[PDB]
Protein backbone atom coordinates (compact mmCIF):
# COMPACT_ATOMS: atom_id res chain seq x y z
CA UNK A 1 0.00 0.00 0.00
CA UNK A 2 0.99 3.61 -0.59
CA UNK A 3 0.44 6.33 1.98
CA UNK A 4 0.46 9.38 -0.24
CA UNK A 5 -0.61 13.01 -0.67
CA UNK A 6 -0.51 15.76 -3.26
CA UNK A 7 2.94 17.30 -3.19
CA UNK A 8 3.59 21.01 -2.67
CA UNK A 9 0.27 22.86 -2.46
CA UNK A 10 -0.10 26.65 -2.56
CA UNK A 11 1.26 26.47 -6.08
CA UNK A 12 -1.86 27.81 -7.75
CA UNK A 13 -0.65 27.57 -11.35
CA UNK A 14 -1.71 25.11 -14.02
CA UNK A 15 0.60 22.73 -12.16
CA UNK A 16 -1.68 21.69 -9.31
CA UNK A 17 -2.90 18.10 -9.67
CA UNK A 18 0.51 17.00 -10.88
CA UNK A 19 3.17 15.20 -8.88
CA UNK A 20 1.84 13.46 -5.82
CA UNK A 21 4.39 12.36 -3.23
CA UNK A 22 4.06 8.91 -1.76
CA UNK A 23 5.49 6.62 0.88
CA UNK A 24 5.67 2.91 1.56
CA UNK A 25 7.62 -0.03 2.95
CA UNK A 26 10.36 -2.01 1.27
CA UNK A 27 12.32 -5.12 2.14
CA UNK A 28 15.97 -4.64 2.96
CA UNK A 29 19.10 -6.33 1.58
CA UNK A 30 18.71 -8.87 4.34
CA UNK A 31 15.40 -10.63 4.51
CA UNK A 32 13.64 -9.94 7.81
CA UNK A 33 14.22 -6.22 8.24
CA UNK A 34 12.04 -3.49 6.79
CA UNK A 35 12.90 -0.09 5.31
CA UNK A 36 10.99 3.12 4.58
CA UNK A 37 11.78 5.20 1.52
CA UNK A 38 9.94 8.02 -0.15
CA UNK A 39 9.32 9.24 -3.67
CA UNK A 40 7.42 11.33 -6.18
CA UNK A 41 5.02 10.11 -8.82
CA UNK A 42 2.76 11.63 -11.41
CA UNK A 43 -0.99 11.66 -11.03
CA UNK A 44 -1.49 9.27 -13.94
CA UNK A 45 0.86 6.76 -12.38
CA UNK A 46 -0.97 5.57 -9.29
CA UNK A 47 -4.64 5.04 -8.38
CA UNK A 48 -6.32 5.02 -4.99
CA UNK B 1 13.42 15.61 -5.49
CA UNK B 2 13.04 18.79 -7.46
CA UNK B 3 15.66 21.48 -7.57
CA UNK B 4 14.57 24.62 -9.39
CA UNK B 5 10.98 25.74 -9.84
CA UNK B 6 7.92 23.81 -10.99
CA UNK B 7 6.84 23.95 -14.61
CA UNK B 8 5.36 21.53 -17.11
CA UNK B 9 6.34 20.11 -20.47
CA UNK B 10 5.13 22.07 -23.46
CA UNK B 11 5.94 21.89 -27.13
CA UNK B 12 6.28 24.79 -29.58
CA UNK B 13 5.47 24.64 -33.28
CA UNK B 14 5.58 27.24 -36.03
CA UNK B 15 2.07 28.48 -36.72
CA UNK B 16 2.24 29.79 -40.29
CA UNK B 17 4.16 26.89 -41.81
CA UNK B 18 1.75 24.50 -40.13
CA UNK B 19 -1.23 26.28 -41.65
CA UNK B 20 0.52 26.32 -45.02
CA UNK B 21 1.15 22.60 -45.05
CA UNK B 22 -2.29 21.62 -43.83
CA UNK B 23 -3.96 23.87 -46.38
CA UNK B 24 -1.76 22.11 -48.91
CA UNK B 25 -2.85 18.66 -47.77
CA UNK B 26 -6.54 19.52 -47.74
CA UNK B 27 -6.24 21.18 -51.16
CA UNK B 28 -4.77 17.87 -52.22
CA UNK B 29 -7.40 15.62 -50.70
CA UNK B 30 -10.39 17.56 -52.07
CA UNK B 31 -9.83 15.41 -55.19
CA UNK B 32 -11.22 12.43 -53.27
CA UNK B 33 -14.39 14.01 -51.91
CA UNK B 34 -15.68 16.33 -54.62
CA UNK B 35 -14.48 19.83 -55.45
CA UNK B 36 -17.49 21.36 -53.72
CA UNK B 37 -17.96 20.14 -50.18
CA UNK B 38 -17.21 21.52 -46.73
CA UNK B 39 -14.60 19.80 -44.58
CA UNK B 40 -14.04 20.16 -40.84
CA UNK B 41 -11.26 19.21 -38.45
CA UNK B 42 -12.15 18.06 -34.95
CA UNK B 43 -10.26 16.85 -31.91
CA UNK B 44 -9.78 13.31 -30.66
CA UNK B 45 -12.84 11.30 -29.70
CA UNK B 46 -11.86 9.60 -26.46
CA UNK B 47 -11.13 6.08 -25.31
CA UNK B 48 -7.97 5.42 -23.36
Amino acid at each position, epitope marked *: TL*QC*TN*Y*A*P*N*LLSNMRGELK*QC*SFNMTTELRDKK*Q*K*V*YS*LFYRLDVVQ | *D*I*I*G*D*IRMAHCNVSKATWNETLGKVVKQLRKHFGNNTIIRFAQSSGGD
Partner: antibody
Framework: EVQLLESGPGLVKPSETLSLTCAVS?????????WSWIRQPPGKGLEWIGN????????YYNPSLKSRVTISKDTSKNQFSLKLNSVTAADTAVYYC???????????????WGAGVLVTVSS | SALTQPPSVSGAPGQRVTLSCTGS????????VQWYQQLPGTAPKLLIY???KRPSGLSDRFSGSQSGTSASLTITGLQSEDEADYYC???????????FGGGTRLTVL
Protein backbone atom coordinates in the same frame (compact mmCIF):
# COMPACT_ATOMS: atom_id res chain seq x y z
CA GLU C 1 4.68 13.68 26.09
CA VAL C 2 6.88 11.57 28.32
CA GLN C 3 10.28 13.15 27.90
CA LEU C 4 13.51 13.58 29.71
CA LEU C 5 15.97 14.64 27.02
CA GLU C 6 19.26 15.86 28.45
CA SER C 7 22.66 16.87 27.13
CA GLY C 8 26.29 16.53 28.12
CA PRO C 9 28.52 19.54 27.54
CA GLY C 10 32.06 19.96 26.23
CA LEU C 11 34.44 22.94 25.99
CA VAL C 12 36.25 22.73 22.63
CA LYS C 13 37.09 26.43 22.32
CA PRO C 14 40.60 26.74 20.60
CA SER C 15 40.14 23.27 19.19
CA GLU C 16 38.28 21.42 16.52
CA THR C 17 36.46 18.25 17.73
CA LEU C 18 32.99 19.17 18.98
CA SER C 19 30.93 16.26 20.26
CA LEU C 20 27.95 16.69 22.56
CA THR C 21 25.15 14.32 23.43
CA CYS C 22 21.48 14.13 24.38
CA ALA C 23 19.22 11.27 25.39
CA VAL C 24 15.53 11.01 26.23
CA SER C 25 13.64 8.65 28.52
CA UNK C 26 10.11 8.66 27.09
CA UNK C 27 8.93 6.48 24.24
CA UNK C 28 11.77 5.02 22.23
CA UNK C 29 14.04 5.90 19.34
CA UNK C 30 11.71 4.45 16.71
CA UNK C 31 8.66 6.02 18.30
CA UNK C 32 8.78 9.06 15.97
CA UNK C 33 10.42 9.82 12.64
CA UNK C 34 13.77 11.11 13.88
CA TRP C 35 15.24 13.71 16.22
CA SER C 36 16.57 17.01 14.89
CA TRP C 37 19.08 19.72 15.73
CA ILE C 38 18.98 23.50 15.45
CA ARG C 39 21.65 26.08 16.24
CA GLN C 40 21.27 29.70 17.29
CA PRO C 41 23.92 32.41 17.72
CA PRO C 42 23.07 34.58 20.74
CA GLY C 43 21.03 37.30 19.11
CA LYS C 44 20.50 35.68 15.75
CA GLY C 45 17.36 33.92 14.61
CA LEU C 46 18.19 30.25 14.00
CA GLU C 47 20.43 27.97 12.00
CA TRP C 48 18.98 24.59 11.05
CA ILE C 49 20.95 21.37 10.81
CA GLY C 50 19.91 18.57 8.48
CA ASN C 51 18.76 15.38 10.03
CA UNK C 52 19.50 11.82 10.81
CA UNK C 53 17.23 8.86 10.10
CA UNK C 54 16.65 6.86 13.25
CA UNK C 55 13.49 4.97 12.38
CA UNK C 56 14.96 5.27 8.86
CA UNK C 57 18.27 4.96 7.05
CA UNK C 58 18.54 8.22 5.14
CA UNK C 59 20.43 11.24 6.44
CA TYR C 60 20.11 14.93 5.62
CA TYR C 61 22.53 17.80 5.94
CA ASN C 62 22.92 21.51 5.45
CA PRO C 63 24.42 23.67 2.73
CA SER C 64 27.27 25.92 3.89
CA LEU C 65 28.12 22.98 6.20
CA LYS C 66 28.89 20.35 3.56
CA SER C 67 31.58 17.65 4.05
CA ARG C 68 31.93 19.29 7.42
CA VAL C 69 29.48 17.95 10.02
CA THR C 70 28.85 14.24 10.58
CA ILE C 71 25.77 12.91 12.37
CA SER C 72 25.10 9.49 13.87
CA LYS C 73 23.19 7.61 16.56
CA ASP C 74 24.09 4.94 19.09
CA THR C 75 20.79 3.04 19.84
CA SER C 76 21.97 1.91 23.30
CA LYS C 77 19.53 4.13 25.20
CA ASN C 78 18.14 7.04 23.12
CA GLN C 79 21.56 8.39 22.06
CA PHE C 80 21.55 10.19 18.71
CA SER C 81 24.60 12.31 19.24
CA LEU C 82 27.09 14.12 17.03
CA LYS C 83 30.76 14.20 16.12
CA LEU C 84 31.17 17.41 14.16
CA ASN C 85 34.77 18.01 13.14
CA SER C 86 37.06 20.95 12.33
CA VAL C 87 35.17 23.84 13.88
CA THR C 88 36.62 27.06 12.54
CA ALA C 89 33.93 29.75 12.50
CA ALA C 90 33.05 32.21 15.26
CA ASP C 91 29.69 30.42 15.57
CA THR C 92 29.74 30.30 19.37
CA ALA C 93 26.11 29.36 19.50
CA VAL C 94 23.44 27.57 21.48
CA TYR C 95 21.83 24.32 20.36
CA TYR C 96 18.61 22.40 20.77
CA CYS C 97 17.36 18.90 20.02
CA UNK C 98 13.95 18.09 18.64
CA UNK C 99 11.23 15.52 18.04
CA UNK C 100 9.25 15.21 14.81
CA UNK C 101 5.74 14.07 15.90
CA UNK C 102 5.10 14.28 12.23
CA UNK C 103 3.20 13.00 9.24
CA UNK C 104 5.46 12.87 6.21
CA UNK C 105 8.51 14.97 7.05
CA UNK C 106 9.99 13.32 4.12
CA UNK C 107 10.15 15.55 1.18
CA UNK C 108 10.55 18.44 3.57
CA UNK C 109 8.38 18.58 6.65
CA UNK C 110 5.36 18.33 8.75
CA UNK C 111 5.89 20.47 11.79
CA UNK C 112 8.84 20.15 14.15
CA TRP C 113 7.62 19.81 17.67
CA GLY C 114 10.88 19.83 19.50
CA ALA C 115 10.61 20.48 23.18
CA GLY C 116 14.20 20.61 24.41
CA VAL C 117 15.20 22.59 27.46
CA LEU C 118 18.57 24.41 27.31
CA VAL C 119 21.22 22.84 25.11
CA THR C 120 23.91 25.40 25.74
CA VAL C 121 27.60 25.69 25.04
CA SER C 122 29.52 28.93 24.61
CA SER C 123 32.71 27.51 23.16
CA SER D 1 16.32 33.68 2.57
CA ALA D 2 12.98 35.06 3.75
CA LEU D 3 11.75 38.60 4.31
CA THR D 4 10.00 38.48 7.60
CA GLN D 5 9.02 41.84 9.21
CA PRO D 6 12.03 43.33 11.07
CA PRO D 7 10.89 43.96 14.62
CA SER D 8 9.80 47.62 14.32
CA VAL D 9 6.15 46.54 14.81
CA SER D 10 4.39 48.32 17.69
CA GLY D 11 2.67 45.98 20.11
CA ALA D 12 0.04 47.19 22.55
CA PRO D 13 -3.22 46.03 24.20
CA GLY D 14 -5.15 47.39 21.23
CA GLN D 15 -4.22 44.36 19.16
CA ARG D 16 -3.74 46.10 15.82
CA VAL D 17 -0.59 44.32 14.73
CA THR D 18 0.14 42.12 11.74
CA LEU D 19 2.78 39.57 10.77
CA SER D 20 3.73 39.25 7.11
CA CYS D 21 6.53 37.18 5.60
CA THR D 22 7.36 37.97 1.99
CA GLY D 23 7.99 34.82 0.01
CA SER D 24 9.07 33.80 -3.46
CA UNK D 25 7.09 31.43 -5.65
CA UNK D 26 9.43 28.65 -4.57
CA UNK D 27 9.02 29.84 -0.99
CA UNK D 28 5.24 30.09 -0.68
CA UNK D 29 4.67 27.28 -3.19
CA UNK D 30 6.36 24.77 -0.91
CA UNK D 31 3.70 24.39 1.77
CA UNK D 32 1.84 26.25 4.46
CA VAL D 33 4.23 27.10 7.20
CA GLN D 34 3.77 28.29 10.75
CA TRP D 35 3.20 30.64 13.56
CA TYR D 36 4.49 28.76 16.59
CA GLN D 37 7.11 30.59 18.67
CA GLN D 38 7.47 31.89 22.20
CA LEU D 39 9.57 33.82 24.74
CA PRO D 40 13.38 33.98 24.77
CA GLY D 41 15.35 32.57 27.65
CA THR D 42 13.78 29.23 26.61
CA ALA D 43 13.49 27.32 23.31
CA PRO D 44 10.62 29.38 21.90
CA LYS D 45 8.06 26.71 21.20
CA LEU D 46 4.35 26.97 20.50
CA LEU D 47 2.49 24.85 17.96
CA ILE D 48 0.10 25.57 15.11
CA TYR D 49 -1.60 23.10 12.79
CA UNK D 50 0.95 24.23 10.10
CA UNK D 51 -1.49 26.99 8.95
CA UNK D 52 -4.64 28.86 9.61
CA LYS D 53 -6.19 26.21 11.92
CA ARG D 54 -6.35 24.99 15.48
CA PRO D 55 -3.25 23.24 16.84
CA SER D 56 -2.74 19.84 18.45
CA GLY D 57 -5.32 19.42 21.20
CA LEU D 58 -5.12 22.99 22.47
CA SER D 59 -2.51 25.64 22.55
CA ASP D 60 -4.73 28.72 22.20
CA ARG D 61 -8.19 29.68 21.03
CA PHE D 62 -6.71 32.80 19.47
CA SER D 63 -4.98 32.87 16.05
CA GLY D 64 -5.99 32.96 12.40
CA SER D 65 -4.24 33.71 9.14
CA GLN D 66 -4.21 33.40 5.35
CA SER D 67 -1.62 32.81 2.64
CA GLY D 68 -1.58 34.38 -0.79
CA THR D 69 1.92 34.65 -2.17
CA SER D 70 2.44 35.80 1.39
CA ALA D 71 2.44 34.64 5.01
CA SER D 72 -0.09 36.67 6.95
CA LEU D 73 -0.90 36.96 10.60
CA THR D 74 -3.08 39.88 11.68
CA ILE D 75 -3.67 39.11 15.34
CA THR D 76 -6.46 40.92 17.18
CA GLY D 77 -7.81 40.15 20.66
CA LEU D 78 -6.65 41.11 24.14
CA GLN D 79 -3.92 38.62 25.12
CA SER D 80 -1.32 41.04 26.52
CA GLU D 81 -0.35 38.58 29.27
CA ASP D 82 1.15 36.45 26.49
CA GLU D 83 3.59 39.17 25.50
CA ALA D 84 5.78 36.79 23.51
CA ASP D 85 7.90 36.98 20.37
CA TYR D 86 7.87 34.96 17.20
CA TYR D 87 9.87 33.69 14.23
CA CYS D 88 9.34 31.90 10.94
CA UNK D 89 9.99 28.56 9.32
CA UNK D 90 9.76 27.44 5.71
CA UNK D 91 11.05 25.13 3.00
CA UNK D 92 12.46 27.03 0.04
CA UNK D 93 13.98 25.40 -3.03
CA UNK D 94 17.52 26.08 -2.31
CA UNK D 95 19.07 22.70 -2.71
CA UNK D 96 16.87 21.08 -0.09
CA UNK D 97 16.52 23.93 2.35
CA UNK D 98 14.33 23.71 5.42
CA UNK D 99 15.17 27.33 5.91
CA PHE D 100 13.94 30.75 7.14
CA GLY D 101 15.07 34.00 8.69
CA GLY D 102 12.22 34.92 11.02
CA GLY D 103 12.12 37.08 14.11
CA THR D 104 9.67 39.37 15.91
CA ARG D 105 9.74 41.81 18.82
CA LEU D 106 6.48 43.47 19.86
CA THR D 107 5.51 45.53 22.88
CA VAL D 108 2.83 46.63 25.30
CA LEU D 109 1.50 50.00 26.45
Amino acid sequence: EVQLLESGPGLVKPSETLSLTCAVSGGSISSSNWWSWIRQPPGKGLEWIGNIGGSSGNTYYNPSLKSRVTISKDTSKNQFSLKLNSVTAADTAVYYCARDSSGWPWDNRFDVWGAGVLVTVSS
Amino acid sequence: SALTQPPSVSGAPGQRVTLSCTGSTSNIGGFYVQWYQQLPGTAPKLLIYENNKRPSGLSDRFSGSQSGTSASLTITGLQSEDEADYYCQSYDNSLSAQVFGGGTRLTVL
